[PDB]
Amino acid sequence: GAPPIMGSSVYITVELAIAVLAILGNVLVCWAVWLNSNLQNVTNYFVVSLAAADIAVGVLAIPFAITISTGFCAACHGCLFIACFVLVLTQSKIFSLLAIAIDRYIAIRIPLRYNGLVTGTRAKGIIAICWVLSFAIGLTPMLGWNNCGQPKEGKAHSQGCGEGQVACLFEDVVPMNYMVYFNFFACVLVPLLLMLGVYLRIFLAARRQLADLEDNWETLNDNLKVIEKADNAAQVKDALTKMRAAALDAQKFRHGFDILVGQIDDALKLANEGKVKEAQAAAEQLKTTRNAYIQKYLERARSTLQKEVHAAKSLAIIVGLFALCWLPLHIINCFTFFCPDCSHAPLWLMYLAIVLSHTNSVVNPFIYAYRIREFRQTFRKIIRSHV
Ligand SMILES: Cc1c(C#N)cccc1-c1cc(-c2cn(Cc3cccc(C(C)(C)O)n3)nn2)nc(N)n1
Ligand SMILES: CC(C)CCC[C@@H](C)[C@H]1CC[C@H]2[C@@H]3CC=C4C[C@@H](O)CC[C@]4(C)[C@H]3CC[C@]12C
Ligand SMILES: CC(C)CCC[C@@H](C)[C@H]1CC[C@H]2[C@@H]3CC=C4C[C@@H](O)CC[C@]4(C)[C@H]3CC[C@]12C
Ligand SMILES: CC(C)CCC[C@@H](C)[C@H]1CC[C@H]2[C@@H]3CC=C4C[C@@H](O)CC[C@]4(C)[C@H]3CC[C@]12C
Ligand SMILES: CCCCCCCC/C=C\CCCCCCCC(=O)O
């Protein structure tokens, strides 16, 4: 067996590199929100809670991980705390991520009421409430769901540990049924699936709204055809009534729809009197209102929904990379736990899976920079002005 300090040295050098980049990158996220009022919306308060958790990974959870890989003699419950602290920070990120998905779902489903429902003061109260539950979830082992009542006394002796001490190792003190049933299944997988449902519902909503617009637009332009090409009064009235509801429905900028419906009322009135050619010609005045007001709403509405879709995809990539960085390690615990006949994943793979999970704390800054113009532009200023 190769001197264990050769593998540890690599693992540790890598952990530190990752802690450095987690700190830098998420500091930049915070500095960017601090400085650009275009980034000071509720959604980004959760971005900031997320970046704080990732700063805390680099400043505390990674040094803790390095520590608890040595097996050092430690009081069992102090071992548990350096083992479990990172579970808190991770739970924090899961709640931020879920909050964000719900925020954008409210934003696209009821845009009209979002600013009176989703306020900065309520966001901050939700964040605080989430941090406190994260401490309760990730430190639950401290409350007694732990292996400190059944230490490995042979192992503690072979290391000369004091009395009451254990060799301090994540899997020796944190029970694996906590890690699998409670943490993984219930505190991680259930929320990720929820977030999956929510982003589903967001994309469906957006897809339905865009079609509604495109329908309303076609109701508008086809019912005109029916008018130009009629020779009967009632044909004109019928086609106009179907433009008016499709106009009021799209209304749900004002000069544009006032004129439009008013001109439709104008033409409806003419058509009820049997003035076919006089209604057909008043209808034609609508086309002028279409080109100048309605088609510009169609397009800005389309543009806003495409931006929400693009934004929601950017945030779902954050959640997928969270899942990618953490599932291997969860999957390993599931084998450790459910297959006592299987050999334990080898050390080298544990190294790989642990460092992989920690790299998640580096990736969010890059997503913002690659996918969110306002962040990317801010990031450039901060770098230039303070190289
Ligand atoms: C925390 C967590 C979460 C969260 N949040 C989610 C899923 C799984 C885990 C998680 C984490 C760790 C772990 C172990 N170490 C210290 C360390 C470093 C290098 C090598 C070694 C040895 C002794 C070789 O095993 N041990 N750091 N994290 N171990 C396990 N099974 N699960
Ligand atoms: C604000 C931040 C920097 C505070 C950080 C405090 C951290 C590093 C402290 C608080 C609790 C501490 C632990 C409490 C108890 C023990 C048991 C002892 O046998 C070995 C050290 C160990 C495991 C400590 C390690 C350091 C520790 C984790
Ligand atoms: C989420 C994406 C990246 C997929 C990740 C799947 C990974 C974690 C899977 C693929 C193959 C798996 C390994 C296959 C075989 C063994 C041997 C067994 O004795 C312990 C589990 C162990 C060591 C598995 C650990 C988890 C593993 C490495
Ligand atoms: C959406 C997906 C990623 C959710 C997570 C899937 C998890 C729960 C699945 C993926 C593959 C599964 C493992 C496949 C094989 C074995 C070996 C068996 O002897 C014990 C169960 C165990 C260890 C399974 C446990 C559950 C498992 C780890
Ligand atoms: C913004 C910071 C939020 C502060 C949250 C503090 C709430 C902590 C909630 C439950 C913690 C449960 C674990 C208690 C550790 C006790 C240590 C011991 O057992 O010796």
Author numbering: -1 to 208, 1001 to 1042, 1061 to 1106, 219 to 307
Text from the published report:
It constitutes a unique chemotype featuring a poly-substituted 2-amino-4-phenyl-6-triazolylpyrimidine core structure. Herein, we report two crystal structures of the A2AAR in complex with Etrumadenant, obtained with differently thermostabilized A2AAR constructs.
The interaction of Etrumadenant with T883.36 by direct hydrogen bonding stabilizes the A2AAR in its inactive state. The 2-aminopyrimidine core is stabilized by π-π stacking interactions to F168ECL2 and forms key anchoring interactions by hydrogen bonding of the N3 and the exocyclic NH2-group to N2536.55. The phenyl ring of Etrumadenant is stabilized by π-π interactions to H2506.52 (T-shaped) and W2466.48 (stacked). Notably, the cyano group of Etrumadenant in the A2A-PSB2-bRIL structure is slightly tilted, relative to the plane of the phenyl ring, towards the hydroxy group of T883.36 and deviates from the ideal planar orientation by ~8°.
